[PDB]
Amino acid sequence: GIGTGFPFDPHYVEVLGERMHYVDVGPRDGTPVLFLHGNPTSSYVWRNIIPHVAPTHRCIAPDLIGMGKSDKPDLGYFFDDHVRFMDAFIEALGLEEVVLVIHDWGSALGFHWAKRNPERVKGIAFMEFIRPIPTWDEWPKFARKTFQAFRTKKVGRKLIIDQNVFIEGTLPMGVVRPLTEVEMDHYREPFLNPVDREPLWRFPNELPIAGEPANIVALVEEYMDWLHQSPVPKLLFWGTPGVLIPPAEAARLAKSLPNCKAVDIGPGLNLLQEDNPDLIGSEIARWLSTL
Ligand SMILES: [Ca+2]
Ligand SMILES: [Ca+2]
Ligand SMILES: [Ca+2]
Ligand SMILES: [Ca+2]
């Protein structure tokens, strides 16, 4: 019922000497909409949101370096690595201003880029995004020991790299409805070879939890500082119970952030796109027409 196909012609562009894959549809009339996925997804996660937006706006959805159909160089796949590649991807497309639609680690990339380039951002729609997590008590109990293991020396790489737990297990556990075997094939494909799973493991180790990694905590705090000042139009989707963003936090941010509307998508964990793609895509399209 929720679409499982990926009916988008591949686009490729060389970025720092590495080929990155992206979706590019819609009319080049006006401001393009840049969709940024997180862990462990790809542009596949936007496949049922894009068709609501492409009738009126150009839609661009890259696969992060080391993910999706993009090349897979020997990197640490730290956040800093993703910043370098995403900075250069956006410059390769010869764009000017954009609207961002961002999720999970794609939201850290998007917010950090918007803070450094605010004249180029005409709106941000965001969901289940990277915020500072003061203590492990704010991580959902049902996932807490596993994410602590992900961040434990030796233990975490055995789970994520050798056993592929983030794809086989954490991914479906971040979706309320069951994922199909075709959907799982699309998500599993980039990571069928264990040596290619480094980004799946480095990302949970980059989460800003209880002050560490200090560099991530600092950068995320700084773009949240910017978001609390900037007049940029903001659209916050949120679900219950969520994962990164509990309902109480969405409610706080909908009052504190300027020019922000919050949208309740109903039941949702992390991949809100997979539980209510039609509300998310439809409401982004309505919101775009008011900018
Ligand atoms: Ca090359
Ligand atoms: Ca650790
Ligand atoms: Ca299933
Ligand atoms: Ca602050």
Residue with token string 């990926």: 6
Contacts of residue 181, Cβ cutoff 8 Å, sequence gap at least 6: none
Cα 176 to ligand 3 centroid, rounded to whole Å? 11
Cα 181 to ligand 3 centroid, rounded to whole Å? 6
Cα dihedral 256, 261, 264, 268 in deg (nearest 10): -70
Query: What is the secondary structure of 103-132 as a DSSP string?
Result: EEHHHHHHHHHHHH-GGGEEEEEEEEE---
Contacts of residue 99, Cβ cutoff 8 Å, sequence gap at least 6: 31, 32, 33, 34, 57, 121, 122, 123, 124, 125, 288, 291
With H, G, I as helix, E, B as strand and everything else as coil, classify residue 38: coil
Q: What are phi and psi of 149, to 5 degrees?
A: -65, -40
Nearest to 200 by CA among 233, 156, 231: 156
Cα 130 to ligand 4 centroid, rounded to whole Å? 14
Looking at residue 16, its amino acid is L
- Long-range contacts made by residues 143-152, C-beta under 8 angstroms, separation at least 24? 143/170, 143/173, 143/243, 146/170, 147/204, 147/207, 150/201, 150/204, 150/205, 151/204, 151/205, 151/207, 151/209
Cα 125 to ligand 4 centroid, rounded to whole Å? 21
- How far is residue 194's CA from residue 160's CA, in Å, rounded to a whole number? 9
On the 0-12 / 13-18 / 19+ scale of CB atoms within 10 A, 281 is: buried
Residue with token string 């959907």: 183
Contacts of residue 151, Cβ cutoff 8 Å, sequence gap at least 6: 204, 205, 207, 209
Cα 77 to ligand 1 centroid, rounded to whole Å? 17
Residue with token string 């919101």: 287
With H, G, I as helix, E, B as strand and everything else as coil, classify residue 266: strand
Contacts of residue 39, Cβ cutoff 8 Å, sequence gap at least 6: 104, 105, 166, 199, 200, 203, 204
Cα 132 to ligand 4 centroid, rounded to whole Å? 10
What are the structural domain ranges in the chain? 11-290
On the 0-12 / 13-18 / 19+ scale of CB atoms within 10 A, 267 is: middle
> Nearest ligand, CA of residue 177?
3
> Nearest ligand, CA of residue 72?
1
> Looking at the DSSP assignment, which residues form a beta bridge with residue 61?
23
Angle at CA of residue 20, ends 19 and 25, nearest 5°? 130
Which pair of structure tokens corresponds to residue 220? Answer: 């995320």
- How far is residue 287's CA from residue 233's CA, in Å, rounded to a whole number? 9
Nearest to 118 by CA among 33, 233, 253, 257: 233
**Resolution to 1 decimal, in Å?**
1.5
Burial pattern 84-106, b for ≥16 Cβ within 10 A else e, equals ebbbbbbeebeeeebbbbbbbbb
> Looking at the DSSP assignment, which residues form a beta bridge with residue 60?
24, 34
> Looking at the DSSP assignment, which residues form a beta bridge with residue 50?
none
Residues in the chain: 291
Which pair of structure tokens corresponds to residue 213? Answer: 């990694």
Which pair of structure tokens corresponds to residue 151? Answer: 């961040």
Handedness of CA 5, 86, 265, 201 (dihedral sign): positive
- How far is residue 11's CA from residue 268's CA, in Å, rounded to a whole number? 31
- How far is residue 21's CA from residue 25's CA, in Å, rounded to a whole number? 13
Alpha helices in 117-213 (DSSP H): 144-150, 155-157, 165, 181-188, 198-206
Cα 73 to ligand 1 centroid, rounded to whole Å? 9
Residue with token string 């789970």: 159
Strands of 134-243, DSSP E: 234-241
- How far is residue 219's CA from residue 224's CA, in Å, rounded to a whole number? 9
Looking at residue 164, its amino acid is N
> Nearest ligand, CA of residue 156?
2
Cβ atoms of residues 226 and 247 within 8 Å: no
Cα 273 to ligand 2 centroid, rounded to whole Å? 30
With H, G, I as helix, E, B as strand and everything else as coil, classify residue 64: coil
Nearest to 116 by CA among 244, 219, 217, 258: 219
> Nearest ligand, CA of residue 185?
3
Q: Using alpha carbons only, how large is the chain's radius of gyration in Å?
A: 17
Nearest to 170 by CA among 271, 241, 277: 271
> Nearest ligand, CA of residue 12?
1
- How far is residue 135's CA from residue 57's CA, in Å, rounded to a whole number? 40
Residue 177 has a CB neighbour count (10 Å cut-off) of 15
Residue with token string 């793609």: 277
What CATH homologous superfamily does 11-290 map to? Answer: Alpha/Beta hydrolase fold, catalytic domain (3.40.50.1820)
